[model samples]
Structure formats: structure tokens, C-alpha cells
Target chain A: VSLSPLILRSLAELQDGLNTVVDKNWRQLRRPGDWSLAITMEAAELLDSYPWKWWKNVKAQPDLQNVKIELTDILHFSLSGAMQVSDELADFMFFPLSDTNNALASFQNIIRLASLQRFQLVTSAVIAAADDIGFNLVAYYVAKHTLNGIRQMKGYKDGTYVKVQKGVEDNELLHGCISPFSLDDVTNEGNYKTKWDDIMHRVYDAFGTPKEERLNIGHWLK
Target chain B: VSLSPLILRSLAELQDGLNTVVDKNWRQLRRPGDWSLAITMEAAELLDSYPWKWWKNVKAQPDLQNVKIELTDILHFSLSGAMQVSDELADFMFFPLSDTNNALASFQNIIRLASLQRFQLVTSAVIAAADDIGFNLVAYYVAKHTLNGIRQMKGYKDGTYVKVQKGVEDNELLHGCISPFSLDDVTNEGNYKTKWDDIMHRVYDAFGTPKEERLNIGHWLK
Candidate 1:
């Protein structure tokens, strides 16, 4: 199927955070090189998750939760880099290394692509790497969210975005509704994912309706 | 006061063209450096219009038509650059150098911002520069039409964007229905803008009535 709603919501939040970072950094330093650097540093953190001991104990089961958390962090940096470089949407996506027979070759290609910072390909490569390692489903879930986050950072919430800078109204929309309302209004003070799900439902209820008649002319009362 | 509908429509069209360029280039090269370069070359073309001779002939009536055309070209590049960087609407534009008291400083500031590719500020700078030169209204008019061209390129027609890439069905809706119809059956090959104006009137006649009362959900039979 397409991306799960769970992934989409999480990505949207990630995009929001990235936009804030990009905005603040650009205003302060007149460039976004720091964000790009941040991605590399975060990627290093992912490497840290698999210490030298992992190679000696190949038979040991990896800590799934730790791997998952580390993957999510990498996703944030990878997507931010892509978003910074361009505004085109990755409308087409596929797991390139799904075939177990070609796993080694696919992993090699991923390394090459990543060294070049080919993010769109890296996005695909990450999925393929996961599939080759039998964690494709988890990888897909995480990458889908990362992609979604890029979409929101590009202004997916407001119809105005053309895959570029975040829209002016995205913040107010995210805090759940416009002025005089805050995150505490619609949320049950619940867990992160559940709170996001609730916010998505509220967002759909509030702004999802068609804004005007077909031509936006007569009798159009919002 | 606010952006004239004429200006708004033009900016939308400009944004559309820029999107097309960005899309095609990114697909071809996986980067948008070409579009960025194109903006600089085009800005140089605009500079060519104000040759050294024009500085000496301050009294002779300038070639308004030539100046207007060059301004349009520059606007295409400038707006494209801004749209490439972000999707925020340029609804609340202001020509900051209108005061005429701090013109040189404003011009210098604009150059500084442009050197760094601060496009939103560059956009404002262009407008302010025009105002400093007493071509604000003329520049607005030229930029407006260029923007309109981009909007049509996007998905705008009549009043709303069909948003399914290029408003093909928007015509059908304008003619008083959705799919399975063409413009031949609508206005007998009349003028495009005039036909759209006519269809807007007809659309209001049909679906303009408030549909479900509150939640906008109901029988909703059009």
C-alpha cells in the first residue's frame, strides 16, 4: 500500500522541526551548511549503535528498539539534507535492494550513492539495505515517515507548498487550529504517536473541507 | 492596497513556470543549479537594458515598452528563484524603498542580499529598486502578467486551481460540469479569459448554493 498514516504523521512533525532549524540557521548564518553537517554527525551516531563488539557476536540478536531509534535519527538528517538541496517531490518510490540474491551488490551501490550525497537514491538505498538485511518492513516504515516529514516541511499541510520552504500557516496548523488555541486543546496529553494521530484527525476535520464553490464566486461563504 | 487580482494571477503563473523548470531540471540532473544560474544570467539581461548611455540621457523619454519587456524577463527569473526556495505566497508585498530618503542604502542592501541568494529579500529588493526608479506601477503591471502566465502554467483557471496538474478538468467545471466534456461544447471557441469569466458565472448558478448547512456533509446532490 501507500505510506501508512502513522508514518505520514511522524514525517510531518519531523519536517516541521527541520523547517524551524533551517529558518533559524539561515537567519543567523546566511546559509544551511550546518544542517548538512548535522546530518553527517547524526549518521555517525547511527554507526555508534553498532559497536565493534557486534562483529564478534554475529549470532547475537541486535537490539531492535535501539536500531529503530537510531534509524529514525538518521532519517531526520537525510531528509533535511534532501529538503535543503531542492524542492522536488519524490512521488515515485521503490525498494531497490529487495532481491536477497543481489544484496552485496546493492549494499555496495548504496555506499557509493551515499558518498556522493545522492539523497533520493540514498532514500531508495536505505530501503534496499533494510530489505537485504530482512528488516525491509521496518525500514520502509521509517523511510516512509521520513519522506512524509519532508513533504510537510515542504508545506504539505497547506495546499500552497510546491515542495519548497515551509508555508507561513504550517506552524499554527500544527499546534492544532489557529490563534487562541494550543497543542493542549485537542490532545489528551497522550503519548507522541497517539497525540499526533489525534492532531491529524482534528486537522482533517478543520481544514480538509473544500474551501469554496467550484469557481469561488457567488454564495461562497466560508 | 492589496495585490490586485491581476498581480496575484500573474505571480501564480510565474510560480508555475518556475516549478516546471525546477521539475524538468531536477529530473535531468538531480540538482537545480541550472535554474539558479539561469536567474543570474537573466538578471544580467535586465541590467543590459539600462546601458551607460541611459545614465547620460536622463531627460530623454526612456523606451517604456523595451524596459517593460526586460522587467518581465527579470521577474520570471526572480519569482522563479523565490518559488524554488519556498512556497510562501507573496500576498503582502511592500516596496520598502518608496520613501526616496534612504534609496542608496536600500539598493546596497538589496545587492548584498542578492549576492547571498536571499531570494525573498531579493524579490522585495527588486520591487523596492523599481520604486526608487519611479517605475513601481509599470513594474507591477509587467510582473503581474508574468505572474499570471506562471499561474496558468500551474493549475489556475477561472478562479480556483483544479490542482490535478494543469487544471484540465477545471475547464469542464467552468463549463458547468466535470469530466467527459470539452471547451468546444462550452463557448464555441471564444476568447480564453472571456470564456473563463463566463463559465465562472455559470458555476455560481449551479454549485454556488450552500450545500450541507453545517459540516458541509449531506445529500450534497449537485
Candidate 2:
């Protein structure tokens, strides 16, 4: 399925919000190459989760959960980079490669596209990579995006943010809570936005986030 | 330019020695994936030197001098990774891409190959990238390899090694010292090896490396 204009706008707006936490002028301060490098770096990190090495550690397994986080990280940069190039999001489809274990190759394809500043191809390739690895990029991005915002507000950069809440790792809890965020629940603009906010509220609930701290689209839709 | 068997062998062996400096069983411990990530990382650093960013700071320029160091850094990993695949180095040629400013793309080519653990191609791409940027990969690799060895031996890992020697930056002095290492002099294995050793000794001489501290193969061929 393709990302709706509303979905793209929400993601881009979130990227704008997050980037400004570091620099209010980030949209201008950062260049396409900056995001290109960011995407490449995150792709490399994702490649590490596979047993792709021909040398030692062939028997090793990458944490699938880590792959989820890494995929979201790539999307974050991809959205930011794509915005620098065009106002219209390129409508493309992502097909998983024949080799499921070739997430490394999928991500490699993303790196090649990123290096050329082909922002749309980079984003599409990332989607292909996530599918190839059986990781739900759509659901993960929403959950991780919210958690990242939560982390930043709680002093994440300064090292004071607690990584674990209520006996589970933040990421573990986020993934657990977002399990209900399926495509069936996100059919239209109203429903998509409604489900998205519901997920955010679920995450906030898990973290004991004060109700006043949540978004004003108040009281989660039943 | 093509790297001769002897040249490739010397580089590989040096890679072996340096890798062992960190862990004796490095060959078995380090994998193709390890070097792939390494190459991609260094390639990103090399790409940064160019003012490829389309956002803020477009007026800025990358340091050519830093590009040379990054190229050599890439080759170090390339040689190591290639050794893991086959006993024979793929005999390939590196033609500089027409667009000199596209070192980012050249390196993107390298990263794609590296991601697939295609080591030899990765090596050739680095050479092409260096040539495109007008950096002499061959001469620089030899010189930097020696200086790296010299640095490690003199407490580089622990940070005791001095970056500057004899009134200049180690890299600056190394580059100046390597100027005499021209292709005109590297016609055959005997002369190549002789010249290779000569360049190392000159570097040693610049750093005031004691005569007794030099490799026995040396006594720079005048």
C-alpha cells in the first residue's frame, strides 16, 4: 500500500518537530547530503542485524527487534531528505526481494539511491527492505516516532531518560503496545489519524504520561 | 591502474599484521560484513569533504588533504576484506569516473559492492574514487600504511603518539615524503619493492626513526 498524502504530511511534520529540537533552523542548516549520510549510516546499522558476514559469527542471529528500530530510523531520515527535494511525494510501490535474508542487499540498494540523492527511491527501497525482513515498517514507524518524541521530552539526549519502564525496555514495551496497529484499522484519513493517535496514547499510557501531556485530540476514540 | 600480485600481497600481509595488532586471530574474528561496514563508513567520511550538501553551508568546501587520508583508510579495510574471499585478488582496473566531483557516487558504488561482500570490486572502486579526486591511491596507501605502523608502535592506541613530526602534520609530512614515489620508478617487482621500502625509510628518516629501528629490507635505494 502507498502512503497517503495525509500520512506523508504527518510524518514530515513530525520530522520537522523532532529535527527542530536540536536546531530550529535544521531544515536550512542540513543539506541533502546530511540526510543521505544519515540514511546510509542507519542502513549499515540495519545490515548488521543479518548474518551476512562470510567470516566469523556465521551462526549468529540479529535481534529482530533491533531491526524494527533501525528500519524506523531509516524512514525518519528518508522522510526528512525527501522533503528537501520535492513537495509531492513520489508514488512508488515496494516489493520484497526474492531472498528474505537479503535485507542487507535491500538496504544496500537504499544506500546506492541515497548516495545519488534519489530521495524517493531511497524511501521506497527502505520499504522494500522492511518487507523483506518481515518487519512492519508502517506500524513500527508510528510507535517508534512517538516513543522518540517521548524520550526527547524526558531528557533523552542528556542521558537522564529511563530506558525501561515498568520492567520492560522502552522499545519492547512500544512494540508490545503497537501490536493492534494493523492496516485494517487505517482505511481513511479520519480513521488513520484516529488510529495513529490511539497508538500514541497507548504508548503514553504505558509510560505513565500525564493526560495533560498528551495531544488535544483528546480521550482516545473508542 | 592495476595492483600487481606482489603489491596486493604486500598490502594484504600488512593488513594482516595490523589487524593482528588488535587481535591475533583477527582474520577469523573479522568478517566480510565487518569490512563492508568499514568501507561504507570511511566512504561516507570521504564524501563529506565535498560540498555536496544542497542545504545550508553550500559555500563550504571539503579539505582535499582529508580526502587522501580517507581514501587510504578505505583501502586498508578493502585489502583485509578481499583476503577473506579468495586467494587471488580480482585483477580489475579502476577508471576514474568522468565526474570528478562524484566521489560520493564512486564510493556509493563501492558501498553497494561492499554490502554484497564483493571485496575486490570494492577495492577497485576505491582506487577509481581516489583517481577521480586526483589523489594517488597507490603511493598514498604504501606511505600511510607505514606511518600507521609507526604510529601503533609508538603508543598510538594509547594516544601517546605525536601527530606532528619535524615541524609538520604526520600526514602532511608523509605526503611530502611520498612525492618521490612515482609510477615511473615502479616498473618491476625488484624496483617496486625497493622503491616501496625506500619510501618507508624516507618516512622513517623524516620522523627521525633511528637507523636501527628501520626494516632490514631498507637502506633507501638511491
Candidate 3:
């Protein structure tokens, strides 16, 4: 249950980055098929790093650094997929170890038993595999890299960014801040990251935490 | 630079699961396109969890558990993509922090500047964002869940399995123990995980380290 500060920081950053990416690509991400397509295409690129010969030649060293980066790429899409579905990072940040035991069988049962089930079975397995293979070092690096991606989104440079999803009241009051009907007319068309940051600030100023925590999202009660 | 023992164990387990999966689905994974296609298809299901209206409603709490699982699903494919591209898990387990900074910019440049580039831009950005948001918690969970999934793979039941990819020399000398070309007819066809473990022992015995340091793959020299 206990984890390092670095790990905690990394997870928080990953959630933010994922939310930012999903928020930025809300239009495309909204379409499940499109979202998945993006993940697979990117994932394929990661796979491409290893050719048939690489497998055949045990002694032939691979571009380890390149492979690490590619793995991070898949992590980006995977986290976004998580954000597309949930609101809170806590939903993912912690769990009992028992949740992982006998996972493959559970996955197979899910396939046979229910048409509707959790989608992370494969992801969990992959995580387990990373652990099995001394992947913590790369996992940390991937987390760090994902945070960099989150920063690429607008308002991240300045500390004025807000990553919370907006309420309907705020959307109407702020004039389509949450989900604008379109992004065609804005000077920076398709720059949802900045637009959302603007909206996030407005929402926070009006309805979020007090001035001290004006930029915070989850705690609007104050 | 230092990681917990649990993390190391888990990563090792994850590697085993990935190798098992790849080894089992070797034929399909051999084709880069097919490999990527699978990653994308699975990724789509993760995206499906969040409907547009879900984002519209600020109060409408998402299915956090479901989202977490879906994220894990994407992680599964993402890691497989990593495995397909690299030989040693160590290749992914470590890297420099600088590699993650301003990753999106670098990734973008790679896209526009080089026709040939490793596709990890989005991934790098995402990692950066995670660092920005402090996402270590869920990242750990994802890793843990992935380990669990790996445990669910075939031959992982009894703790007697090996998931290493072998070369032709090893395969031929070991007589299909290291890399069984087909998974169709053997009475233990579905038991590659355990069988491979047996073969790994046989291999180590024939071509591994001495009793003082047995079961080391990369170092058969001593």
C-alpha cells in the first residue's frame, strides 16, 4: 500500500497528462472506435521496433532506448483510454494485491461469461509482465515521459491550468466552456488544451476552491 | 535509481507473462501490422467506457473501477508492443530523466523532420504530463495489475515456467524446448509456460551457469 513520493508524483502527473490529452482530443477521443484506432496504430509503431531478425538473433542488441521510448508511447494512449472513462485518478492509483491474482483465468471467464466487463485485463497482465521483467526503471521513465506529454498541452507552461471537467451550470454561465458545440471559429482552432484551460480557470474562479487554491479542481466545496 | 524489491519481483513476473503471451501467439505477433492491429482494437474498448455525455455531466461520476480496468487493458497491449520491440526487459527498465523532458516537442520534431523515427512522441508527452500531475500511484497499480494479469497466463499456476525467447541454435540444440514452432498438437501444447520452464532448466543445465549462479540467461559465459 505504501509507495514512494516519486511514484506518487508520477501517477498524479500521468492522470493529469491523460486528462489533458483526452480533453484536448475530446472530439476524436469521444468516438470509441477512433480512440482505440489511435491506440493500436501507435502501439503498432512500438511493435515495429522489433523486427523478426531481432527475435532470431539473441546476441543482436536492440535499440534499448528506442524500445523504452516506444513503450512510453503506448503508455500515453493507455492512460488516455483510462481518462476517457473515469474522472478521478484515485480510481486507478491504488488497489489490493489480491486483485491481481489468477488474472488470466478471470480474463477468460470475462470473455465467456459477460459481454460487458472491465477492459483492463490485458493492461493488468502487461503491468504484471513489466514487474516480472525488471521494468520498474523504464516504468518510472515512462511515467516521467507521460508527464512531459501532459505539459505539452496548453496552460501547462503557466501555472494557470485547470484539469477538471466542467459542470453544466458553468458551461452555460461561461458560454460553452465545458463542451463547446464546435472548435472551428476560435483563433486557435483545435487548440482545446488552451481553451479548456481558460474554461477551467473561469470555472475555478467562479465555482472552484478559494483564491488560495483557485487552480484546484476536485475540491470546489470551499 | 533504487527500486523496492517488490517492484523488481513484479517486473520479472510481468516479463514472464509477456513472453508467454508472445511465445504463445508467436505467429500472429510475427507480423508487425497484425501485432499493432491487435493493440489498437483492444485499446478501442478502453475508449468506449466514456460516453460524451459522461464528460458533459460534472456531477455524473464515472465508473472509476471500470475506467481503471480499461486503462489496464490498454496497458496490456502497450507492454506487448514494448515486448515485441525489445529483447531484454532491462532495456525498458531504465532511462535518463532528461529523455522525458519536453518529450512532445521532440516527438513532434521526429514526425515532421524524420520519415524514419520511433513513434513515441505522444507517449513522451503523456509521461511528461504525468510527472506534471504527479501520477505515481495509479502507475504502480497499473504495474501491479499487469503483474496479476501475467500470473494468469498459462503455466504461471505452479511457479514453474520460463518465458525467454530462444534462438535457432538453442531451439535446435534444446530440441524445441526453447522455441516450439507449433502450439497445435503436443498433449502439453497449451502448457508452454511450464514446459518452457522445464526446458529452461534443461538449457541452464546444458548451457547455463554453474551451481553457484544458475538460471541466468544473458550470462551463460561463466
Candidate 4:
């Protein structure tokens, strides 16, 4: 799947924005392996959503919502890891769809890639796995990326963040906030920039990140 | 802590022994990253045993027994990985104890090392973590390694292995089976090789592995 140059660049900038907000020199503080492990853990979390156990909880079903959320988590780290290695990878890397129905095997490849500091391949694997699962990686990444910005701005690292407000969980509000847009509108119809902007604005609005402190593309866009 | 040269050499042979019994050319079929991923998965399983959630099951206790099992699983893969990289690492690699109580941080380092194919450092972290947790890494590894051989010989990958026998789980049997031995007998004294041999034999005996077919250090020893 090919990524739009604009979206990729903006996301890379936004990742740096997110990183710098969280740590003044996150790049110095973190290495590519940190993000690779982040990808590995989130990918494992996504894999756990599958009913792979045959022991006591034999009748359990997958954590379906978690599959989406953790896949997005993998997406976030893929971008974070990619940016650490190369701007070309961060802004322009893509691979043909993996086209395999089996993602556990794909995830094995991802973990292998993570092990070797092959961030480019890890990014490819995440996108491929997203494609095979029919999840919109970029759009959800945009959503979560904004929420992360909101999280940091409101003291998430210090434990003072209110994760729920007005009887709706912060994550829950993202669902309602995201329901209004379709990714195909951004992908094929060429409204990617505006669409991403709207998602961020709506999420910030939902969380009351405050008009002055709210993070916008302008915060990161070059 | 320094490892005994004899025990180290014998365990390397045993690891190769275990790998070969599972696959005639297991070394050629699996890469170091495969085992690193195995470590990552098991380490994640070990981490999951901790009560890390804040949203639900806030009072959940760590999966204490499973922690032991998964940590042992990491031990198995650590040897498997180190052997794939270098026999020196598999046999003689040792590190000063990490002396850190925060294994989560140590684990973060392990995942990063895994990502970079730094199998030596990964092995070091495992040893250090075992030290911090008061775990007898070598002893339990011998136990689980024998069990792994039994699983393969009895058709584990093909799914006919009997994981539960006589209402006692195989893993449960290992706990009782291990109850009689103290690692200090080998670590502080001079009985390392024989003690290691005893653990392997006892585990085989507990599983009722046929004597003629049982795995012994002789299988891989040069």
C-alpha cells in the first residue's frame, strides 16, 4: 500500500511534535530499538486479542476493540521508530500489500524485523498487517496521535490527567469524534489534509484540550 | 556471577541436543530473531503476570505460578538464541548482576537488545533478572528444557502431546518435581554438573519419559 507523501510527512512532523512535547529531547532519550520494542509489545497485545489459548478460558473470544486500538498503537511506534532512522523511511516508505490472511506469521516477521533494527521492514509489516485486517492504519493513527497530544498537554506523564470527562471515557469520545469521517474520502478523494485536521480538532474539542493549548497541525507542520 | 565451565559446556550441548531433537536441522530452520521473538513473547507473558492494568481488575494479583513458567520459557529461548549466535555466549557468557529491582526497565532493555540481535546482552539481562527475583535460572531451565524435549518427542507441534496427565498438569508436576532440590548445592558448592544431571533425569522421570528415549546431556555432548 502506498502512503500519501503529505500525510506521511505531516505524521512524521507530528510524531516529533508528540515526542518533543513528552520529552524535550525524546530522540536523544530514545533509540530506534525502544520504538521497535513498543511495536513488539503492542503487536503482542494485538495478538493476545485472538483466542489462542486452550486451557481454562477455552470459550473466550478475542478482544476485538483492543485489536484495533493496539494495531493503532503499533502504528504510532512504527512512525516513531521510522523517523529515528531516516526521513525517507519516515515520509515515503511503502510496500505492496502482504496479501496474507495469516498475520501471526506477518507479526513474526515484524518481531524479527524489530530484533534486527530493521525499522523500515517493521513499518512495512504493520501496514501490511493493517491491510490484511482491513483496518485503516493512517486514519486511526491520526486520531490516536491527536489524543496523545491531548494526553501530554493535560499532564498524562504526571498522573493528573482526567482520562474521562462528562461520563465518556477519553477513548470512547474518539469513537464518536471519528464517526463523522471516512478514510476513503481522504485516500481516494484527495481530502486527506482537511480530513486529518478535522479529526484532530474534533478530538481536542471533545476533550476540551482548551482553545489556546489545543494542538493543531500547525504545532508540527513544516 | 560466574558460571561453571563444565555446566556451561554441558548445557550448550543440551540446548543443541534439544534443538536437534525437535528438528533434524533446527539451526538452519530458525534464525536468532525467531528465538528473540520467542523471548519477547514469553517476556511479555511474564510481564502480563504483573497487575499492570488500571481500568479493570485493579485488584488483580499477578499470575504467580505462570510467572515462573514463562520466565523459564524465556530461559529456554535465551539459550536457544544464544546458541544460534555463538557457543561462547551459550557456554561462557556471564554478566555482573544487574542489581536493579525494576525488571520492567530491565525488560525494556531486553526488548531493545532483542531488536538489535544483541543476544549476548539479552542473555545477560535474563541472568540478572533471575538474580533479582531469587530465581534459580539454570535449574528450572534444565527442568523445562527436558519437558520441551518430551513435548516434541510426544508430538507437541502436531498437537497430540498430553499436557495434562492424571488430573495433574505437566507444569504442576514440575513444581513438585523441583521441590526436592536446592540450587545452592550446585551454585555455591562443587556439585554443579551432577546436580544439573539430576534435575534433567528427575524431570524425565516425573514425565515418565521412556528411559531409552529420554534426553540426556549425552545427546549433544561432544
Where is model 1 more than 4 Å wrong at Cα? Answer: A1-222, B1-10, B18-36, B51-65, B86-112, B130-222
TM-score of chain B taken alone, every candidate: 0.39, 0.80, 0.35, 0.81
lDDT of each: 0.37, 0.68, 0.35, 0.66
Give the CAPRI class of candidate 2. Answer: incorrect
In terms of DockQ, the best-performing candidate is 4
Candidate 2 structure quality by residue, lDDT tens digits, A167-203: 8678888787777767656436667777777777788
Clashing pairs in model 1, backbone N/Cα/C closer than 3 A:
A11-A149, A165-B86, B9-B148, B10-B147, B10-B148, B11-B147, B12-B151, B13-B150, B13-B151, B14-B150
- In angstroms and one decimal each, the interface RMSD of every candidate reads 25.8, 10.2, 15.1, 9.6
By summed lDDT, the worst window of 10 consecutive residues in model 3 chain A runs over: A108-117
Question: Predictions ranked by lDDT, top down?
Answer: 2, 4, 1, 3
TM-score of 3: 0.26
Per-prediction DockQ: 0.01, 0.08, 0.04, 0.11
Best by TM-score: 4
Q: List clash counts for every candidate, in order.
A: 10, 0, 71, 1
lDDT of 1 by residue, A1-222 (tens): 223445434453455454453344533442233333333333433333342121122234334434434445445545555654542412222344233224323332332333345655555445444443444333233233333343444455444345323563222233222223232332223443443343334444444433331111111111
Task: Find the 10 residues in a row with the least total lDDT in model 4 chain A.
Answer: A92-101
Q: Write the per-residue lDDT of candidate 3 for residues B1-222, one digit (tens) a residue.
A: 222444333433554444454366553544433333333333333333333222223234334333334334444334444444432212222223234223222322222211111213222322333344333322332333333333333234443445443643221233322233232211133443343344445544544435564333222111
Between candidates 1 and 4, the lDDT winner: 4
Q: What fraction of native interface contacts does model 1 preserve?
A: 0.00
Ordering by TM-score: 4, 2, 3, 1
Q: Write the per-residue lDDT of candidate 3 for residues A1-222, one digit (tens) a residue.
A: 122444334444545544444365564545433333334444444433443222223234344344334444444444445544432212322223223222222222222111111224323433443343333432333333333333333344444445454543211233222334232221233452343344445544444335563333232111
Better of 1 and 3 by lDDT: 1
Better of 2 and 4 by lDDT: 2
Pairs in clash, predicted candidate 4: A115-B115
Selected candidate, larger DockQ, 3 vs 4: 4
| Model 4 lDDT tens row, B1-222 | 446666666666777777776677887877875776667677777656665433223356666666668767766677778877863433322233222224444554555566566665666666665665666777777788878877777777655667777797787667766666776755544666567678789988887778888756555567
